[PDB]
Amino acid sequence: AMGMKMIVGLGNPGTKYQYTKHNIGFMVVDKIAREHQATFKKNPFEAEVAEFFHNGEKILLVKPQTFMNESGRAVGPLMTYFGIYPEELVVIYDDLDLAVGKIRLRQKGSAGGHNGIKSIISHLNTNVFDRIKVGIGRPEGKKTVVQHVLSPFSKENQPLIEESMCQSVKAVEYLIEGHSFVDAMNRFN
């Protein structure tokens, strides 16, 4: 297996969570959908799945609907459903260790305390897979981590988060146009 076939954006289902930091993965793949104008359908593997085409090939966008900490429960089986492997995966999600307005691309690494990534590592039996970390900043003021990730972005940070979602979409476009992930790392890191 080689070549990107699936982009997973992490987050929690429901209107309550739709603008919270921990749903930044949902937001990016939503943006990627609208700029491919593509359609998300409920899927039996506890996910919303959209499909679009580039040249003659299918690219899938996935929003697990399990809640964050059980994301792998959707992603592992869904990936088996389409016959795809961790090498063909890109996961997009929120990174506390990155400032709002920044993104980082990585090929591997531990969950580092992110329980959605922990679930995907568990269900895939590897921590080697491409990912786009979208900065959500360290917890602001006196908030706990959970209060921080389960709350919206501040007015100050809204233009910065829009910039980093634009950059995340540009990185994905770069991948869809055929550049390698190493190439994308050189360009966006």
Nearer to Na ion, 106 or 170 (CB): 106
Q: Is residue 123 flagged as an active site residue?
A: no
Helix (H, G, I), strand (E, B) or coil at 178: coil
d(CA 61, CA 52): 8
| Structure tokens that stand for 124 in this block | 């895939």
Out of 22, 36, 114, 148, pick the active-site residue. 22
The nearest distance, CB 31 to Na ion, in angstroms, is 14
d(CA 26, CA 7): 11
The nearest distance, CB 23 to Na ion, in angstroms, is 5
Residues at the site binding Na ion, with contacts judged by CB under 5 A: 17-18, 106-107
The nearest distance, CB 105 to Na ion, in angstroms, is 8
Residue ranges at the known binding site for tRNA: 17, 67, 69, 115
Among 129, 103, 123, CA closest to 5: 129
Q: Is 35 left (phi over 0), alpha (psi -120 to 50) or beta?
A: alpha
Nearer to Na ion, 15 or 55 (CB): 15
d(CA 25, CA 128): 19
Nearer to Na ion, 18 or 154 (CB): 18
Active site residues: 22
